[PDB]
Amino acid sequence: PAQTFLFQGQPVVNRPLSLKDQQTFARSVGLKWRKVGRSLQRGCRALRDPALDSLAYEYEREGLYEQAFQLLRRFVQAEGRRATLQRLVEALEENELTSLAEDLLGLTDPNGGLA
Ligand SMILES: *[C@@H]1O[C@H](CO)[C@@H](O)[C@H](O)[C@H]1NC(C)=O
Known part of the structure; x- marks a missing residue:
């Protein structure tokens, strides 16, 4: 990477x-x-x-927060160090989650507009 x-x-x-x-x-x-x-x-x-x-079967009953966490755990488990910030940020941008991408990148003004 x-x-x-x-x-x-x-x-x-x-x-x-x-x-x-x-x-x-x-x-x-x-x-x-x-x-x-x-x-x-x-x-x-x-x-x-x-x-x-499979992730949904195992974790849907544990809630939305846990399902999302487990998605990234499986990504890291599979790819190791190649599971990067770049790959996640690109996926977020594609899915209209740019504010979240900016949060991860440290680009968000903490005292800016509510997202
Ligand atoms: C992914 O897409 C397939 C094909 O439509 C579907 O059967 C499956 O349930 C989907 N998995 C999701 C949405 O987690």
């Missing part, structure tokens, strides 16, 4: 997903975890069908 990438025309540092990234994602995406998973399926064989249905 590259050490940097371009986001919104801005250079940002890449890294493996962090615990903080996973918590922030799980706190925010809700039902959109499935659409983000669909985006991640394209570059992650281990998330291809029926893996998202």
